[PDB]
Amino acid sequence: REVKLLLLGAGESGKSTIVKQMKIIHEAGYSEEECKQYKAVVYSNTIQSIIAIIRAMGRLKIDFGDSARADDARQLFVLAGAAEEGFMTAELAGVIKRLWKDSGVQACFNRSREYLLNDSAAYYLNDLDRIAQPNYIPTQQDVLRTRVKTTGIVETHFTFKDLHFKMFDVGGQRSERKKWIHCFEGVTAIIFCVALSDYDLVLAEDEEMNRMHESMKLFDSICNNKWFTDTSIILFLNKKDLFEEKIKKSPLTICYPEYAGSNTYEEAAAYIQCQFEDLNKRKDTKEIYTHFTCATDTKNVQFVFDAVTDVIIKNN
Amino acid sequence: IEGLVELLNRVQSSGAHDQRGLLRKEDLVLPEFLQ
Ligand SMILES: Nc1nc2c(ncn2[C@@H]2O[C@H](COP(=O)(O)OP(=O)(O)O)[C@@H](O)[C@H]2O)c(=O)[nH]1
């Protein structure tokens, strides 16, 4: 009846989004009053996003389509600094709209695989008309899209199909060997999140293998560690929507030079599924439970988490 | 294994900071190319 769940996976893989989804699906979710509280973080996320892109234009030596935008860009830092946390002025709105629309800013945005741009950037910046209004109320999806900093381990608890779930997301905060051992102790299932769309990210300077291969190295280690014999290993191949949009223009050979298949969603996604499941060295004993997911899609998470729950039940 | 902890700490830390939470003073330092 008591079920301990550990979310693992790279930063930006979708862990805290899943946590939020469990709140929406299996807890009370977000009321309109709570949603109003996320307004400031929506604005900051939006501004961080366009700033991140402006910075990359500098590093990447991409010029603005129209040179007037440079003053907008200069102004953005002043106006964002003038603050009023939770409120966007007509002038800030204007500055951001004209930046997001600039052909150079767009050129840089399309080159996001060369730098680190969060996946909520397009979502907010494409919704500027709705968002910038002084009467704007964040929808549940807006809230789901928010990016907050956190203090260490996160835990939500909920009851589903008569089970007490404790879902732990350790997150990007560095933890000592002892904290991990405590986390691993008494674990029913591990959900390993993978950002599919990370396949085309440029190698960092100190990095020997690409993000996907590091994710694979970690998963090999978790999945084959004898301590997890009776632990249900669940693999979420996440950001499938973003993967489907990318696979057309960025070949999977960026990530897997040996890939000989086509660049259809179907063949390239299957290929990644095999790369992961083939790391299982105890194939006859151990079964990976793999789902392709869009963590920001509430329906999909609900469906997938339903199948996962049936798996944990049956494993008795 | 200690090998697993190395991987975990490395792999789970990665990605996009400076793009989380409320606006902070450091996030708003003008880019050099705009000076
Ligand atoms: N389009 C899309 N965005 C996603 C998906 N999963 C997560 N995101 C976004 O990617 C970013 C990283 O998600 P997050 O839950 O914080 O990953 P975490 O670092 O492991 O906690 C956020 O901006 C999310 O909105 C997905 O399946 N599709």
CB contact under 8 A, A74 and B34: yes
Query: Contact A299/A234 with Cβ under 8 angstroms?
Result: no
Q: Which atom of ligand 1 is nearest to the CA of A242?
A: 1
CA distance A97 to A21: 30
CA distance A50 to A55: 9
Place of tokens 């946590």: A19
Q: Which residue on chain A is closest to B1 by alpha carbon?
A: A225
Suggest the residue from B5, B20, B25 to mutate for an interface test with chain A (most A CBs closer than 10 A): B20
CB neighbour class for A173 (10 Å; exposed up to 12, middle 13-18, buried from 19): middle
Documented resolution in Å: 2.4
Q: How many CB atoms lie within 10 A of CB A271?
A: 17
Long-range residue pairs from A120-129, CB within 8 A, at least 24 positions apart, any chain: A120/A45, A120/A49, A120/A145, A120/A146, A120/A147, A121/A49, A121/A50, A121/A52, A121/A53, A121/B19, A124/A42, A124/A45, A124/A46, A124/A49, A125/A46, A125/A49, A125/A50, A125/A96, A125/A100, A128/A46, A128/A93, A128/A96, A128/A97, A128/A100
According to the CATH classification, is domain A3-30+150-312 in 3.30.1360.200? no
CA-closest candidate to residue A232, choices A277, A184, A189, A168: A189
Which CATH architecture best describes the domain A31-149?
Answer: Orthogonal Bundle (1.10)
Domain regions of chain A by residue span: 3-30+150-312, 31-149
How many whole angstroms from A17 Cα to the centroid of ligand 1? 6
Q: Give the nearest partner residue to A81 out of B9, B16, B28, using CB atoms.
A: B28
Q: Is residue A296 in contact with ligand 1, taking CB distance under 6 Å?
A: yes
